[PDB]
Structure formats: structure tokens, C-alpha cells
Design a protein around this ligand. Structure first.
Ligand SMILES: O=C(O)C[C@@](O)(CF)CCOP(=O)(O)OP(=O)(O)O
Ligand SMILES: O=C(O)C[C@@](O)(CF)CCOP(=O)(O)OP(=O)(O)O
Lengths: 320, 324
């Protein structure tokens, strides 16, 4: 029997991945830039047994659903081909995330599975190839191989499409993210990629957004990073508005949280917001101002709905 | 002695959006717009000028308006007094036959009816152009209400040059209709567009496409090409709402139900009922459809929406009118 266990942390995209150039290999229409979070993660143990008939995934103690079981089986097929065996695996996975709060486990789940498999089957994959393996499960997972800032290079094929870690001289140690708890990303983004009247607008600005953001981290320039990523995040959501037919991930409460962020800026508490495939609002903020910003939120939201996390420096990690 | 006049003006809905002012004081817009004038919804406004009157008075649907609206209306009438070269104050009696509680706007038809009423009362002999200009000062969209069918508001660059005109459609307005999906709300158009215009990160994007949209739209009506019209106006409308998303801080007029309404429109398209939607400063979804499909399209909506929430109107051919 072959087993291994690993922990991967979720990451939030500051420059968004939204829309695939290639649905089967998960190659993106554009590069993305993300930060990896300390607080939320997945621990996954994988066990390969000559005895097993089909792949098993137990998550937080409970067997998973149809589509997920199928989603896992097709993914392990990839792992089997790569490793060169025919072993089925029993996967035991736990998400360390506030429950029923809508946090995406996608990135942390596949990065963790990829790394656990790597360990179990002794593949000694390089980070590049680990990121590649993770990508095949979920595009965002490619980034969770790394800590701090990470960039997913879109490439043009399976070999060239992967993430890498960005050294920012420890800037990530100065930063945090506040979550305000309030249609599938894969399904949402394919509709928008395929049909949206505003998608071209998204493509025309994404590289510049990205360049500006990467420059800002080179200078550890928070306001400048913050401004571009906020703009970029909003433009992603604009594209869904142009889909055929239109849709939104946002609700009034998301807008209320956004308004609170602008006010914090006016009161000289720099922070910037972004949203993914749901109404949750994430507030990038400097650690020094994290408590102050949270207080401003507490005036309006339940304390239980205001959850802060640091940015973790290290990457995916083997659990011995 | 006593000078009175009474007018009926119909509301209009924009297919190409006015959204954002170049001049807040005189209400000169950042771009041209194109609308259609609704047969079913209108305002009737009577104005009576009397030397004895010492202050303008406004009665709306039989009721006091309040010192706020009262003050606002007197400011507007000053414009009329300056225009007429008199100092006569007016008693204004107005009835809105517009589902305002249901969220439809009354300001376009209200200000158009008032402009026309004063012109009739005072015998100003204003051209439709000057009527449009007078209406515009009260509310931009009111400039278009002077006219029936398809109308366009030319933005101009000053108070003399910004006004609307009626577009001759070869009677195409008679083939069209508009379904209103009243959606459970619940930020003014003037204040909203101002925040967006001043502030929105996506406003330039709106500006870079509006003229092309408008030219395509007008070319579409020249040809009575309903699909060509519907497609561009629907994209225009959506782009207008995108800009709000970019404002500092962002906001939307749209709620989940609005999105549900758009979805049904798209199903209607796939199912051979051509129609297209647009939304204004509220979650209500308006559905441009050909008169011959009005009923079929309403029934698709009637599968999910309360019957009282689905209201259709034809498009009127004629413009603002003087009545008894
Ligand atoms: O994370 C980002 O860059 C942006 C988003 O989070 C915004 F919602 C999308 C994530 O995409 P994902 O869940 O990875 O899709 P998959 O490849 O189809 O599994
Ligand atoms: O009708 C349109 O062109 C589009 C809108 O309806 C979309 F909400 C805006 C109307 O603006 P309006 O109320 O006329 O503004 P005012 O000049 O500040 O009174």
C-alpha cells in the first residue's frame, strides 16, 4: 500500500482567472495573480491499495457526491497515467474552513491531492510539475502549490501552463485579508467566456492590470496594488453582466461591504476589496490596519461574519 | 385675467441610455439617447396663471406635494417666467397615469406635460424644439416625451443646442410593444448617474461605445430590423449598468428577480419569440417585443410572475397633446 498526506492552503486571486482557453486541460484565457492564505486549508491523505476497485473520497468524514466522485475519478485517471500504475485510491480529506460560509475549497483541495499523490507514489515532482498536476483538477489549485504571491502563467499547452511563487522580500508578512461572509465558477466562467458581450473588454485590460500589480509588489506599494486589483476584480464581474443571459454573484450586502471599504480609505485605513464566485467580499488590508478595518465592519456586520486571515509565506506542505 | 392650459404627455423608455451629465445645471448629457414613447402611461397637467397668485402651487393626484417639492417646482416655474417675460405665478394640477408605486418613472412625462401646458397657457408659440429644451431643464428624459414613436435626444453643447426630435419610422412604432415586469425592489437616476459619471472606472468604456450603439440602433430602425435593433439596445442597456458597477463605491439597480426576467427573455428568443430587455434606475425589466408576439411573450412571463406584475404598453405615434 502507498500513502501520503499533505496540507495545501487556499489562495485568493487579485488578478482573476476567468474563462478557459482549453476546457479539457484547463488552460486559462489569461494569467492570474493570487495570495495564499494562512487560515483556510485542506489536509488530504491519499492511500493507494492494489485491493481497491475504484477511487474513494471521504471529506470531513462524509462520502462526497456523484459529480465529485466522478470528478475525482477522472482526475485520478490523470494521476495513474502520470505515475504509470492502475492503483485506485482512498482519499481522506478535511477542509479547515468556517462551515457553511461559502468558502471555495477548490484550490486547496486539488493542490493538496496533487501533493499527497506526489508523496504517496514518490514522484518527486518539481514545483512546476506539481502546479501542472494541480491545474488539471482546478485552475486555481495550480497557485496553491505556493505561498505568498503566486502567478499562474497561462502558457499555451499542458506543459507550459503553470504557476510559480513570487518572492516579495517578505511583503506577504505585512498583509492580511478580511472575509465578510454573505452558479459554479467552472460553469459561470464558461458561460461568460463563451457568450459575454463584455469579455473582449476584459481581455483588453487584463495584461496591463497584471503588469501593474506585479510592479506594485516589486515596490511593496499597497495603494497601487490595491487600486488595480480592485478595478480588475470589478471588471471580472462586469463580464458576467454581459453574459447570454446575464448573471451576478453579488447581492446588496456585497455592495454594503464594498461601501465600508471605501469609507475606511477615506478615514485613512487603506484596504481594497475583491469577490470571487459568490457574494463574499474579501478585503486586502495591511496587518497594521487590520483590526481598525474590522471594527468598521463590526458596526454593520455580525462579528461571526467578519473573519480575518494572514497571508502564509510557505507553500504546499507534506504532513509526516 | 386668468391664463390656463392643460397637456397630456406620455412617458418614454430609453433604448439607448442617457446616463451622466456634461452640465448638471442645464442638464446637458454626456451622450445622445434614443427612446420610444409609450401609449399606456402618461401625465395630465393643467396650469392656471393668475395675477392674484403670490406663489406657485402644485397639486398632484389631488394632494399637497409638500414644501420640498413645492420649492423645487417654483424654481422650475421661474424658468418659465423668465422665458415668457412675465412674473405670473401658477396653480399646477397634475395627475400621473403612470404606475409610479410599481417603480415606473414619472419625470419625463411630468416635465413634458408641464412645459406644453405653460406654452399653451401663455401662448408662447414654442416650437417642438423649444418645448423639448424647456422640458429638458426639468429632467433630461422629459426632452424626449414631447415626441411620439422613436425619438432621439441630441446632446448638443449648450442650452440652445441640447434637445430631442422625433424620428420618422415609416410607422414602425405601430408594430412594436413593451412589456413591463414589475420587480420587488427596493437611489435616484440623477444622483446615481452623477456618482457613476464622476467616479466610475468603467465610464470611459461606456463613452467609447455609445455612439456606435446609437448609429447601429438608428440604422436598425431605418430598416425596421427588429433583431438588429434589439441586440444592440440590449447590449447598450447592460453596458449602462456595468458602469455603475465601476463607480466609487460600486452599486447596482438590479436584483436577482431582474436576472430571472432576462433569462426568460433569452428563452423566448431560443423558442422563436424575438424580444429584448432593458432596465433603468430600478430592478424593473422592460421588454421590447413586436406587437404580434406581445401576448405570447407575456404568457411565458406569466408562468413565474404574478399577473399583476406584468403590464404591457403599445407605442404611441403622436406627440405631446393639449387637452381640455
Ligand atoms: O481564483 C480565480 O482566479 C478567480 C475565481 O476564483 C473567481 F471566481 C475563479 C476560480 O476558478 P476555478 O474554481 O479554479 O475554476 P476551475 O478551473 O474550473 O476549477
Ligand atoms: O431615460 C434614460 O435615458 C435612461 C435613464 O432612465 C436610466 F435610468 C436615466 C434617466 O435620467 P433622468 O431621470 O431623466 O435624469 P435627470 O435628467 O437628472 O432627470
Amino acid at each position: 500500500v502507498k500513502s501520503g498526506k499533505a496540507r495545501a492552503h487556499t489562495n485568493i486571486a487579485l488578478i482573476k482567472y476567468w474563462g478557459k482557453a482549453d476546457e479539457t486541460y484547463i488552460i486559462p484565457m489569461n494569467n492570474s495573480l493570487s495570495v495564499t492564505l494562512d487560515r483556510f486549508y485542506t489536509e488530504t491523505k491519499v492511500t493507494f491499495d492494489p485491493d481497491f476497485t475504484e477511487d474513494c473520497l471521504i471529506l470531513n468524514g462524509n462520502e462526497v457526491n456523484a459529480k465529485e466522485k466522478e470528478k475525482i475519478q477522472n482526475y485520478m485517471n490523470i494521476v495513474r497515467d502520470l505515475a504509470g500504475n492502475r492503483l485506485h485510491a482512498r482519499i481522506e480529506s478535511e477542509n479547515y474552513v468556517p462551515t457553511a460560509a461559502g468558502l471555495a475549497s477548490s484550490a486547496s483541495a486539488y493542490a493538496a491531492l496533487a501533493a499527497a499523490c506526489n508523496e504517496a507514489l514518490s514522484l518527486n515532482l518539481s514545483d512546476t510539475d506539481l502546479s501542472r498536476l494541480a491545474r488539471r483538477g482546478s485552475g486555481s489549485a495550480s497557485r496553491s502549490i505556493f505561498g505568498g504571491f503566486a502567478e499562474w502563467e497561462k502558457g499555451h499547452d499542458d506543459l507550459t501552463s503553470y504557476a510559480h511563487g513570487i518572492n516579495s522580500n517578505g511583503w506577504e508578512k505585512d498583509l492580511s485579508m478580511i472575509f465578510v461572509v454573505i452558479v459554479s465558477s467552472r460553469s459561470g466562467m464558461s458561460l461568460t467566456r463563451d457568450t459575454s458581450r463584455f469579455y473582449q473588454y476584459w481581455l483588453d485590460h487584463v495584461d496591463e492590470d497584471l503588469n501593474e500589480a506585479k510592479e506594485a509588489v516589486k515596490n511593496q506599494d499597497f495603494q497601487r496594488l490595491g487600486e488595480v486589483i480592485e478595478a480588475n476584480g470589478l471588471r471580472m464581474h462586469a463580464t458576467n453582466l454581459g453574459a447570454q443571459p446575464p448573471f451576478t454573484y453579488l447581492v446588496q450586502e456585497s455592495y454594503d461591504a464594498m461601501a465600508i471599504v471605501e469609507q475606511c480609505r477615506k478615514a485613512n485605513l487603506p484596504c481594497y476589496f475583491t469577490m470571487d464566485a459568490g457574494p463574499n467580499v474579501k478585503v486586502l488590508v495591511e496587518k497594521k490596519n487590520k483590526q481598525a478595518v474590522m471594527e468598521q465592519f463590526l458596526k454593520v456586520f455580525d462579528e461571526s461574519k467578519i473573519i480575518a486571515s494572514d497571508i502564509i509565506s510557505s507553500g504546499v506542505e507534506i504532513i509526516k
